[PDB]
Structure formats: structure tokens, C-alpha cells
């Protein structure tokens, strides 16, 4: 028995069709699997916090999988906070609770789809090198955790037989002004820099960055988390899986997790199926013991202790011509295979500041 | 071991001598997990304790 | 119009002079149309159903700030965090007081939370000067591994780095620790003498005893000791020469509540400028953006310098916390917090009666015994050292 939660009206009319079309799409002995869709819509908790424990009370299902449609992440710790409570696993296929949110509360069960930003932060640099692009510098604003992403840079470059290059800003304020930054982003020792900050505070910078007239292809930037031309971000293969596999693979995690337990004897787990049946919670354990191979077509989905993906499949995306994202290379189990082939230099992805000064 | 003798008796401790355990004299290099890099050999161990 | 701020409370009784705090606005600055309202509501008595008690109550109710106040009932941290969850995602800025943890002290999680109280992670830098004067070099510290424990350690390493490098040996252990004296064994191997403990309300116990059977509180030994270990239980079976500390406002939720309005008030005075003044969302039936100076908001609560109350030293740093609180260093000499000096910020100390370190050493015992029997390490070289 596995529960689906949908929010957002473009799955309204959406979320009917896709039940019995995954219930054969896996089959496994010992377990059934009922999915449900809910066409409620409405970002206040009224709904977030009466519908699912209605639910709980009605079907008694065990996994829940969560989905949105906006990028704001500011639903994940209210998911947060039921899963610790209830002790019911979760797990998050895309949408608002597809951020790292770090530390995790101690006996929650929160499990999503995604890689920490020292995770996604080490695929560049294998680019860096492939393109021959040594020189870079490292440049963010003030982010909740910003202080990590300064760490990973150098314990690359410290060793390597290459002898890297490294500089940086600190921190930059986009109500400081976009003339004042222009003249203090001049601080640079590099053709390279790194990007890192927030989606809605990415928005000044750029214009800045225009105004400062760093944003065509004789520079380039790396996004982690207007637009230039020739800029690169990570996006671990968010837009790929359509829809009905992303479903079809949150089910699938879920009926081999339960299977972990049952193997060693007979369980069948209740405790979360109510939310006001019973004034106790101290009755949980094994909650992440578990849950440490998650192996499905031909790959593996790992998960560490903490609660975080640890076997992705990083994918970085290009910018095109028109205005849109596509994927150039990828990264699976460290082969990086590149397409776009990579041949010469200074004409695919880069371009010199001026012609006069490249001669062969 | 014929000059800590020596020095055992003018500063007047004692001493329990015993070889090195792997058998190198000391450099620094990286663990696998990011870069906290340590000591080895006999150079590691007079930091340990 | 109305300027109502909610608030959540242990007691309807501790209610009845917040309205009649708030009624007294008049006297304040401006004055032209404020009108303070409690809209306060008691704590349910289970965390699972007080997030039902907010959305239809406190947010429906047109509300800026929340005070959230220790529960009566010991519990461990269960009501603080659904209030900052309810309000962070509305980023509607959120003050607090009487949480001593240092979990609502980062951003990734509480985006939003000013505690008027200090926590157990600066109470460590007390014992960095507090020894300073005493002249201690070298320490050791017995200390729990969870995430209050490793809070305190990466604070003393660094304050301790420039003035003596690193401590000699740090300790850890699991926080439900059974009859484990296998780390104790090492604990009269470093000739330190000074061994500071930051374990839990209950695991003092354990550690106390255990020291109790290898004659290790006796004659020569200091302690220095957290609050946590003397309150509750943790009295019972003590070392007779603790020198842990206490709080002079803590427990005292009135102490800050007319501390809390005056903050507020202040603060709602100077959001009055040419800028956007627009109002939180109403009610919370349906809402999705978030009112644009709900963050300046905050930004103007950490530039509130309320120069009334305690002392007038109502301060914050770059994080929510309570600034030059006095802890009132305290004793034990014979069954008895004897107090014997005070801290405000820099230490100075008011020697009432006399100190009895452990063992009943009238003189302050210094830390330190040198071993005469050393290990050596020798390598197999040919003309040097033969094998």
C-alpha cells in the first residue's frame, strides 16, 4: 500500500490516470500497492496537515511520495516535521522537496532524490580539466551555508600532479548597487567563475553582471543551485524520467524498503497510520538502519545514514542559442562521457577576448 | 642509545625504548575522505601521544 | 490601525499581565495610533495539535511576532520548533525566550528565531577567562557526542587556539553511556587535573560515580562543570569542589515578557518610513506570497538597542542571542551553592567566604604532574642504532 500526494492544478486532472498504470508496473511478492491522487491544491498547511493524516486513518498506508510543481522549497521541513513524529518513511521524487535540507531531525525517515553541494560541487571540476580551463575563481554571497562550498574547492587543486590557480571573492550585496559591484566584481584573477546563491537573489546579480558586461561568451559561469550566453549548471537529471517513471521509481524504493524489514520475520508496521489515535510516540527504532542498497535498473540508489542520496547521476546543462537548457555532458559511476565533442580550444563553449591577440 | 644513556642520568628521568611500528620516518599525505591530511611513521607518533 | 502581535504561552495565568503590559503603550513613542493587543493563546498540551491552534488563530488574527516560552512540563524541545516551522514559512520574524539549545541557532533549518537568553554553546566561553585569571594552562574535557556536545567543543577550540594552541585531550562518548569506564582509564594519564564535563541532565550521574570509584574527585583535582550538571538529579553524587555555574534571569518568564514589548513596541515605531509598509497576509485559508518587509523586519529587530530592563543591555549579534548575561558563578562547600564571585561580561570576582577545592584543599591545587618515565621511538639505522 503506497500513498501519492499531488499538489498543483496542472496534475489535477492528471493525477487519475497514472494509478493503475503503476500498479503493474512493479510487482513483488508479499506486497500490495493501492496509489491514490489528491487534487488538493493550496500552499497554507490546512490541507498539508488534516488531508494526509485522514488519509492515514482511512487506507493505512505506509510511504508517502510528494510532489510540486513551483521550486520553492519552503514545504520540506513541514514535511520535515511529520516524518520524525509519525515515523513514516518519505521519500520525494521532484518538485519543492528536492533541496538538501541539512542537518535532518534524529528519528525522521526523510529521504529525497538529490546531491549535497559538495556532491554536485566535485563533477566540475572534471570538466574544468577535460576543456583545459585550469584557471578559475570562486565567487558567492551570503548563503545559509556557504562556508562548506569554500572548503571542497582546494582539496582538488592542493593536490593533482597540474599545479591550479586559485581566487576569489567574499560575499556580494545586490542592494549595494549594480555600478558599485560592476567596480568591485573588477577583482578578478581569472576567465572562470563559480556561482552560488539563491534562486531569487540570482536575478540582480545578472543584471549587474550586465551592467558590469561579463555576461557574453568571452566569459562563462557555473550554476549550482538575463541569462548570459554560455552558462552551465547541474541539475541531476531533474528534467529527465518524464513523469510516469519518476512515480513508477518512487514506488519502486518504497515496496524494496519495506521488503528489508519483512525479510528477517513478519512485521506489519501501523504506528504512523494515525496521527490522534494515540497519545505516545516513543515506540520507534531501526528508522534509517535500513534503506542502505536501493538497487533498480541496473543502477543503484544509495542512501546514507544522514538521509541523503550518495550514488546520483550528475548531469550538467548548457545554455543554447535560443534561450534554453540542454544536456552536453554527463556522470555515471565516474566515466564522464562528453558529447559536443571536445576538439580545439577557445571556439566551443569559450571564446578569447579578442581575435588579435589568438594566433596559432 | 649511547647518548640517551647519557642524558637519561644528567636530567635524571627513565625512559622504555621501542621501534617504530611500521618502520618509515615521517611525511604528510591526504586521506581518501577530502583532504585532512596526517602524519605517518615515526614523525605520526610523537603527535598521537 | 491596530498593531497586534501574537504570542504563545505555558499558563493562561502568566496571560493577565501580558494584556496589561501591552495596555500601557501610551507612554511610549509615537503614540499616534498604536494599539497593543495580546492575542495570545496557551500552548496545547500536545505539539501535534498546536499547529492547528496557530493557522486559524495567530495568523488569521493579523500578527507580526510570536513569544514562545518554556513549557512547564520538562520537555525535551517539543514545543519551540513547530512555532518557527508555522512561522518560517510565512517568514513572519519570530522571538523567543528560555530555549537553552544550540539548535535554534542556525539558519538552515530556524531561519527565524531571536532568543533573548543565551545558550550552552557561549557558556563555554566563560571557562576560557574563568581559568585564565586562575592561571590553568593545559585541559582535558570529558564531553557528550550528540549534537549539543560537539556544539560547545568546536566554540572552546577555537577561543582556547590563541591562547593555548589546542587542549591536551578530548573525550567522547555515547549520551546513553551504561557502566563505561573505559574512557576513564586515560583520565589520570595526562596529568591535567582539570577535567570540564558538558554531558546531559541524567549522565552526570554515571560520570560521577564512576569517578567516585577510582578516587578521582580527591585531593588536587578542579572541575569545572555546565549548568546542566548541577540542576535536577545531577546535585546528587557530586565531587565536593564543582565550580559550575547557574542563570540570574533564566527561569523567570516575566523577567522578559515586559523585556519582549518594549523591543517590539520600539521596533514597530521605526518601521514608520517612506518604504512599503505593507501588512502580513491575512488569515490562512489560502496565501502564498510572503509580504517583502517581513525580512527587513528582522533587520530591524537586530538593530534594536533597548536601553531599559535588565540593565539596559538588551543586545543581539549577528544571530538571535541574549548579550552580556550574568551566570553567578557557583560553589558546592558541603552540601551547599555557596556563591562565590559573579561575571558580566569580564570577570571580576567578589571572593564571599572561601573556595574548598575537591578533597578539602584550602589552597587552590594546581593542575599539573610531570612524569619521569618516558616512551621513545628508535628506527633500525646501521652506524646509529644497531637491532
Same mark, same amino acid.
Given at each position: 500500500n503506497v500513498a501519492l500526494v499531488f499538489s498543483g492544478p496542472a496534475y489535477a486532472a492528471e493525477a487519475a490516470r497514472l494509478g493503475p498504470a503503476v500498479a503493474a508496473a512493479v510487482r513483488s511478492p508479499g506486497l500490495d500497492v493501492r496509489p491514490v491522487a489528491l487534487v488538493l491544491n493550496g500552499s497554507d498547511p490546512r490541507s498539508l496537515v488534516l488531508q494526509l493524516c485522514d488519509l492515514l486513518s482511512g487506507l493505512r498506508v505506509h510511504g508517502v511520495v510528494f510532489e510540486d510543481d513551483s521550486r520553492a522549497p519552503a514545504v520540506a521541513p513541514i514535511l520535515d516535521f511529520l516524518s520524525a513524529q509519525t515515523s513514516l518513511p518519505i521519500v520525494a521524487v521532484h518538485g519543492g522537496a528536492a533541496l538538501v535540507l541539512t542537518p535532518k531531525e534524529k528519528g525522521s525517515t526523510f529521504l529525497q532524490l538529490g546531491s549535497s553541494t559538495e556532491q554536485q560541487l566535485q563533477v566540475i571540476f572534471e570538466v574544468l580539466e577535460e576543456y583545459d580551463w585550469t584557471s578559475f575563481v570562486a565567487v558567492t554571497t551570503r548563503a545559509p551555508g556557504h562556508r562548506a562550498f569554500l572548503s571542497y574547492i582546494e582539496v582538488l587543486?592542493?593536490?593533482?600532479? !597540474?599545479?591550479?590557480?586559485? /581566487? #576569489? %571573492?567574499?560575499? $556580494?550585496?545586490?542592494?549595494? =548597487?549594480?555600478?558599485?559591484?560592476?567596480?568591485?566584481?573588477?577583482?578578478?584573477?581569472?576567465?572562470?567563475?563559480?556561482?552560488?546563491?539563491?534562486?531569487?537573489?540570482?536575478?540582480?546579480?545578472?543584471?549587474?553582471?550586465?551592467?558590469?558586461?561579463?555576461?557574453?561568451?568571452?566569459?562563462?559561469?557555473?550554476?549550482?543551485?538575463?541569462?548570459?550566453?554560455?552558462?552551465?549548471?547541474?541539475?541531476?537529471?531533474?528534467?529527465?524520467?518524464?513523469?510516469?517513471?519518476?512515480?513508477?521509481?518512487? !514506488?519502486?524504493?518504497?515496496? /524494496? #524498503? %519495506?521488503?528489508? $524489514?519483512?525479510?528477517?520475520? =513478519?512485521?506489519?508496521?501501523?504506528?504512523?497510520?494515525?496521527?490522534?489515535?494515540?497519545?505516545?510516540?516513543?515506540?520507534?527504532?531501526?528508522?534509517?538502519?535500513?534503506?542502505?542498497?536501493?538497487?533498480?535498473?541496473?543502477?543503484?540508489?544509495?542512501?546514507?545514514?544522514?538521509?541523503?542520496?550518495?550514488?546520483?547521476?550528475?548531469?550538467?546543462?548548457?545554455?543554447?542559442?535560443?534561450?534554453?537548457?540542454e544536456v552536453v555532458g554527463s556522470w555515471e559511476q565516474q566515466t564522464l562521457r562528453l558529447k559536443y565533442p571536445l576538439w580545439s580550444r577557445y571556439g566551443r563553449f569559450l571564446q578569447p577576448v579578442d581575435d588579435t591577440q589568438h594566433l596559432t | 642509545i649511547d647518548l640517551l644513556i647519557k642524558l637519561a642520568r644528567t636530567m635524571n628521568f627513565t625512559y622504555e625504548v621501542h621501534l617504530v611500528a611500521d618502520g618509515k620516518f615521517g611525511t604528510q599525505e591526504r586521506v581518501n575522505n577530502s583532504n585532512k591530511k596526517e602524519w605517518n611513521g615515526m614523525m605520526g607518533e610523537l603527535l598521537s601521544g | 490601525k491596530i498593531v497586534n502581535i501574537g504570542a504563545v504561552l505555558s499558563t493562561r495565568k502568566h496571560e493577565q499581565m501580558f494584556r496589561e503590559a501591552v495596555n500601557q503603550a501610551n507612554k511610549r513613542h509615537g503614540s499616534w495610533k498604536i494599539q497593543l493587543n495580546a492575542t495570545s493563546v496557551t500552548h496545547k498540551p500536545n505539539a501535534i495539535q498546536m499547529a492547528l491552534?496557530?493557522?486559524?488563530?495567530?495568523?488569521?488574527?493579523?500578527?507580526?511576532?510570536?513569544?514562545?516560552?518554556?513549557?512547564?512540563?520538562?520537555?525535551?524541545?517539543?514545543?519551540?520548533?513547530?512555532?518557527?516551522?508555522?512561522?518560517?514559512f510565512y517568514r513572519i520574524p519570530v522571538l523567543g525566550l528560555t530555549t537553552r539549545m544550540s539548535i535554534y541557532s542556525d539558519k538552515s533549518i530556524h531561519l527565524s528565531f531571536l532568543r533573548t537568553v543565551p545558550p550552552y554553546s557561549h557558556q563555554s566561553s566563560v571557562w576560557f577567562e574563568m581559568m585564565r585569571v586562575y592561571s590553568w594552562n593545559h585541559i582535558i574535557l570529558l564531553v557528550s557526542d550528540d549534537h549539543e556536545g560537539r556544539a560547545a567543543q568546536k566554540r572552546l577550540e577555537t577561543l582556547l587556539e590563541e591562547r593555548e594552541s589546542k587542549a591536551e585531550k578530548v573525550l567522547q562518548f555515547?549520551?546513553?553511556?551504561?557502566?563505561?569506564?573505559?574512557?576513564?582509564?586515560?583520565?589520570?594519564?595526562?596529568?591535567?587535573?582539570?577535567?570540564?564535563?558538558?554531558?546531559?541532565?541524567?549522565?552526570?550521574?554515571?560520570?560521577?560515580?564512576?569517578?567516585?570509584?577510582?578516587?578521582?574527585?580527591?585531593?588536587?583535582?578542579?572541575?569545572?562543570?555546565?549548568?546542566?550538571?548541577?540542576?535536577?538529579?545531577?546535585?546528587?553524587?557530586?565531587?565536593?569542589?564543582?565550580?559550575?555555574?547557574?542563570?540570574?534571569?533564566?527561569?523567570?518568564?516575566?523577567?522578559?515578557?515586559?523585556?519582549?514589548?518594549?523591543?517590539?513596541?520600539?521596533?514597530?515605531?521605526?518601521?514608520?518610513?517612506?518604504?512599503?509598509?505593507?501588512?502580513?497576509?491575512?488569515?490562512?485559508?489560502?496565501?502564498?506570497?510572503?509580504?517583502?518587509?517581513?525580512?527587513?523586519?528582522?533587520?530591524?529587530?537586530?538593530?534594536?538597542?533597548?536601553?531599559?530592563?535588565?540593565?539596559?543591555?538588551?543586545?543581539?549579534?549577528?544571530?538571535?542571542?541574549?548579550?552580556?548575561?550574568?551566570?553567578?558563578?557557583?560553589?558546592?562547600?558541603?552540601?551547599?551553592?555557596?556563591?562565590?564571585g559573579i561575571y558580566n561580561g569580564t570577570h571580576v570576582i567578589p571572593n564571599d567566604r572561601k573556595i574548598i577545592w575537591p578533597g578539602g584543599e584550602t589552597e587552590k591545587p594546581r593542575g599539573y604532574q610531570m612524569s619521569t618515565r618516558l616512551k621513545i621511538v628508535t628506527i633500525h639505522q646501521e652506524p646509529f642504532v644497531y637491532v
Open positions: 587543486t592542493d593536490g593533482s600532479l !597540474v599545479g591550479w590557480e586559485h /581566487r #576569489g %571573492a567574499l560575499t $556580494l550585496d545586490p542592494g549595494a =548597487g549594480e555600478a558599485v559591484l560592476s567596480a568591485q566584481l573588477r577583482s578578478v584573477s581569472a576567465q572562470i567563475r563559480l556561482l552560488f546563491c539563491a534562486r531569487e537573489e540570482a536575478e540582480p546579480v545578472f543584471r549587474a553582471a550586465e551592467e558590469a558586461g561579463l555576461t557574453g561568451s568571452g566569459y562563462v559561469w557555473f550554476m549550482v543551485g538575463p541569462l548570459p550566453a554560455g552558462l552551465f549548471a547541474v541539475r541531476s537529471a531533474g528534467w529527465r524520467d518524464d513523469l510516469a517513471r519518476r512515480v513508477a521509481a518512487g !514506488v519502486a524504493v518504497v515496496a /524494496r #524498503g %519495506a521488503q528489508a $524489514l519483512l525479510r528477517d520475520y =513478519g512485521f506489519l508496521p501501523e504506528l504512523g497510520h494515525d496521527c490522534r489515535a494515540q497519545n505516545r510516540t516513543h515506540r520507534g527504532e531501526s528508522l534509517h538502519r535500513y534503506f542502505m542498497n536501493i538497487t533498480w535498473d541496473n543502477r543503484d540508489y544509495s542512501f546514507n545514514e544522514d538521509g541523503f542520496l550518495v550514488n546520483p547521476s550528475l548531469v550538467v546543462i548548457s545554455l543554447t542559442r535560443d534561450r534554453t537548457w | - | 491552534s496557530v493557522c486559524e488563530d495567530l495568523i488569521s488574527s493579523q500578527v507580526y511576532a510570536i513569544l514562545v516560552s518554556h513549557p512547564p512540563t520538562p520537555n525535551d524541545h517539543f514545543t519551540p520548533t513547530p512555532v518557527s516551522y508555522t512561522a518560517g555515547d549520551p546513553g553511556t551504561k557502566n563505561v569506564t573505559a574512557l576513564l582509564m586515560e583520565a589520570k594519564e595526562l596529568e591535567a587535573r582539570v577535567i570540564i564535563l558538558s554531558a546531559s541532565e541524567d549522565d552526570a550521574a554515571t560520570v560521577y560515580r564512576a569517578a567516585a570509584m577510582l578516587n578521582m574527585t580527591g585531593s588536587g583535582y578542579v572541575w569545572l562543570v555546565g549548568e546542566r550538571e548541577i540542576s535536577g538529579n545531577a546535585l546528587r553524587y557530586a565531587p565536593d569542589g564543582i565550580l559550575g555555574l547557574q542563570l540570574i534571569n533564566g527561569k523567570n518568564e516575566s523577567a522578559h515578557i515586559s523585556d519582549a514589548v518594549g523591543v517590539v513596541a520600539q521596533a514597530v515605531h521605526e518601521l514608520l518610513e517612506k518604504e512599503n509598509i505593507t501588512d502580513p497576509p491575512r488569515g490562512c485559508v489560502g496565501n502564498t506570497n510572503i509580504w517583502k518587509t517581513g525580512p527587513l523586519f528582522k533587520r530591524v529587530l537586530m538593530s534594536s538597542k533597548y536601553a531599559d530592563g535588565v540593565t539596559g543591555r538588551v543586545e543581539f549579534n549577528e544571530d538571535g542571542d541574549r548579550k552580556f548575561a550574568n551566570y553567578s558563578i557557583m560553589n558546592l562547600q558541603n552540601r551547599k551553592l555557596v556563591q562565590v
